[PDB]
């Protein structure tokens with residue numbers, strides 16, 4: 526069928542990394558997890574992800590000047606679920622860095638990308654958010670987590 | 683450093699699966715490998731990927747009625763490379779099925795997703811292609827290939 530649960534299950538067979546998208550307002554960290562990160566363009570540098578239109582967190586991020594994207598590492602399985610929590614501290618047991626731009630990054634992750642919204646494209650029950658990348662940090666020693674079939678896996682062979 | 687080479691390096695640290703996007707035109711299969719597949723919407727059912735604007739294959743696919751997407755499995759490292767090859771038979775070595783709609787699928791993959799173009803969103807040197815899913819089949823729980831840092835990896 527093309528029902529939401531059946532679609533969700535089928536989509537889950539396609540593996541992908543997971544990001545934290547986060548920023549700080551008045552010293553308070555605001556963020557969410559997304560499995561829909563896409564590296565889009567090199568010139569100019571663009572990325573994208575898809576946000577649920579019903580999100581109550583996204584309205585608190587979308588007007589901020591800069592957002593931090595962190596590609597979660599293979600030990601951040603609990604962190605990924607925690608960043609998705611409806612209630613509770615989404616940054617529990619995490620170490621983070623807040624840049625002067627307000628972008629927030631998670632320490633110990635594979636990649637940090639500082640980003641700014643370029644376009645918002647309505648897409649069914651989500652919105653595709655296209656962002657410009659303004660800064661990059663790579664941590665070569667941290668392999669990434671992979672979200673697949675509802676679970677969090679590490680790369681092997 | 684925000685040069686193309688620096689971005690390629692950084693972007694390569696993001697792991698993702700690889701899909702075959704394929705169709706048959708006048709008896710000849712046409713396709714490419716993409717690692718930028720993302721699920722977009724459940725209601726209505728939408729997915730997307732990012733296509734290079736300079737692609738010479740995409741113009742052969744973009745006006746077709748229906749495209750086949752197959753998620754590549756861990757045995758398909760060779761298949762992914764071949765489906766990306768700038769010359770030669772991109773389907774060499776593969777078992778495929780072609781539907782009456784023209785959509786083409788790879789046998790031995792976990793999921794077959796049939797779809798048609800919904801929107802084309804310019805995005806720098808790529809275009810984000812939003813597709814409306816018309817049919818989806820889970821064939822079996824075949825473990826996927828993962829593209830990461832220019833290598834084809836399996837899940838541990």
Ligand SMILES: Cc1cc2nc3c(=O)[nH]c(=O)nc-3n(C[C@H](O)[C@H](O)[C@H](O)COP(=O)(O)O)c2cc1C
Nearest residue numbers: 557558559560561575576577580581582583606609
């Ligand atoms: C592994 C995983 C991947 C997720 N991917 C997305 C996503 O790509 N887009 C999205 O809007 N929410 C995604 N979520 C949901 C959020 O992270 C979070 O649960 C949601 O934003 C919370 O509701 P709120 O924004 O109304 O506070 C994901 C959650 C998990 C656990």
Ligand SMILES: Cc1cc2nc3c(=O)[nH]c(=O)nc-3n(C[C@H](O)[C@H](O)[C@H](O)COP(=O)(O)O)c2cc1C
Nearest residue numbers: 714715716717718732733734737738739740766829
């Ligand atoms: C693992 C892998 C992932 C790829 N992902 C994409 C992609 O997401 N988008 C894209 O336009 N090309 C992608 N390519 C490139 C194509 O598969 C192919 O090499 C290209 O379309 C060939 O050039 P042509 O379209 O001018 O024939 C990928 C190639 C490989 C090996």
